[PDB]
From a paper:
We chose a derivative of DMAP as the artificial cofactor due to its low steric demand, which will facilitate its inclusion into the protein scaffold. The protein host around the cofactor was rationally designed on the basis of high‐resolution crystal structures obtained after each variation of the amino acid sequence. The location of the catalyst is in a shallow cavity at the surface of the protein. The system was evolved through repeated cycles of mutagenesis, activity tests, and structure determination. According to the presented structures and calculations the catalytically active site is too shallow to undergo interactions with 1.
Numbering used by the authors:
A (entry chain B), D (entry chain B): 13 to 136
B (entry chain A), C (entry chain A): 15 to 136
């Protein structure tokens, strides 16, 4: 739901995902990474299913951060693909792809893959 | 920036995108494959000040597979880079997540790769 | 080497493995999820002379989901590393490919992640 | 089939995949990468579906290379997951994960993802 997704979320790295789920299916907000070549907040934008199934499945969504802000540029971008699962212990379960700029010859080695689990309470 | 325009991948899907001065990607995506018909909204981000050393321009975008005609309860993100030159291309790898229960969540994401060029695959 | 033994992931699957002197991984895998029953053969490889700087030990293995009882026309590879210490773990990400026609090949691979420890998830 | 898979294959990077598909579902052979921190041949081992479906689908398979041989050790391993599709232009279509040794704190950034298409004739 709009209400369930909008707010502040934290992953296992301690990063802070601040998002608003708009009525039109848009995700907007800011991302602060606790890891990598990043400082302070970055713009994010994405999309979510604004009319999810009523069978107990999660709500599919994704978003992108390009790692450039007013302070620095790490010539890279991450996309997160996953779903919101509501309930007592709400979660956004994601897989991500982090691509960094590379020459054509080195393009084969230009994308990391990983996974982040977002919860409403900070871990550890 | 080279990114703005109409692009096609190897499946024949149509990616119509505008790269704005604020680092945003906006536009529409029409998939030639899967549980999809007509155009879907996309939004993303790109590096608006890329390196000048021959590296590509990092970018990503998302489509949620709901429009006025269909809802496939799923979303794809593409992560990759624009490479300019004689034959400009956008090389991507993608993640397609479909809604699932928590118990079936382990099997909820496909991975793949799409290469986009400006040549209509007529 | 620490790798030889019985490991369990967060799904409750059972990975019984031997890390041999020649860099090979051999053993059996029992999945607690999906189109799978009983044990399946696995084979893989690991770095038999890892760095001494605190880095983990890189490794990977494959299961094809055919045994004497079932054939799910699919295979999973796990890629990751062993990290030793008080609570040894094997952190992995995996790719599960299922047989498909060429036309449906774009939608033929799931991606996920499994973390293995030696604690029976009783 | 055993006959279709066994032999020498080439990917778009110019790497050489030499494999034997055994009756027991085993893949064995050697891999020579044209890219990255690699020289000469490396041992590979994997598995394939030795009784695939008869409906026109491909044959699921995977294999692993640890990037250590008699000459060097790059403290890393790649797995390829994919399928053999037989016919006039036989192919092995794969996705891969390349993991390199990392400390626990840097484990989030320890795996590259990519894709290789193997054919019976060298490209370009
Ligand atoms: O580190 C960042 C930007 C921050 C990413 C933070 C990541 S997003 C997924 C995960 N979840 C989080 O919450 N945080 C992390 N970008 C790089 C990566 C590697 N780079 C190269 C360059 C050249 N060769 C190899 C690698 C340089 C720039
Ligand atoms: O097909 C789509 C939406 C269109 C995706 C098009 C894809 S995007 C990457 C690729 N590049 C393109 O240009 N086109 C393709 N969504 C399905 C996925 C599978 N779904 C399930 C549900 C339950 N269990 C298993 C699978 C149901 C929803
Ligand atoms: O379920 C299995 C085999 C068991 C996989 C167990 C997985 S391995 C990674 C994870 N870690 C574990 O410990 N366990 C799970 N194979 C299916 C996959 C989906 N299949 C299709 C076919 C056609 N269209 C779509 C999907 C049919 C075959
Ligand atoms: O390059 C190789 C080994 C050869 C891989 C060849 C790859 S297999 C998939 C693709 N298909 C091929 O045919 N060939 C390529 N291994 C590394 C990678 C990155 N490494 C680090 C270390 C520390 N921080 C970051 C990165 C160091 C060791």
């Amino acid at each position: 739901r709009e209400a369930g997704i909008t707010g502040t979320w934290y992953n296992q790295l301690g990063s802070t995902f601040i998002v608003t789920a708009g009525a039109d299916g848009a995700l907007t907000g800011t991302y602060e990474s606790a890891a990598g070549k990043a400082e302070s907040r970055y713009v994010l934008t994405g999309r979510y299913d604004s009319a999810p199934a009523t069978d107990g499945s999660g709500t599919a969504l994704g978003w992108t951060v390009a790692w450039k802000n007013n302070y620095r540029n790490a010539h890279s971008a991450t996309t997160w693909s996953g779903q919101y699962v509501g309930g007592a212990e709400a979660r956004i379960n994601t897989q991500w792809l982090l691509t960094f700029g590379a020459t054509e010859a080195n393009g084969w080695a230009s994308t990391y893959v990983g996974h982040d689990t977002f919860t409403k309470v900070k871990p550890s």
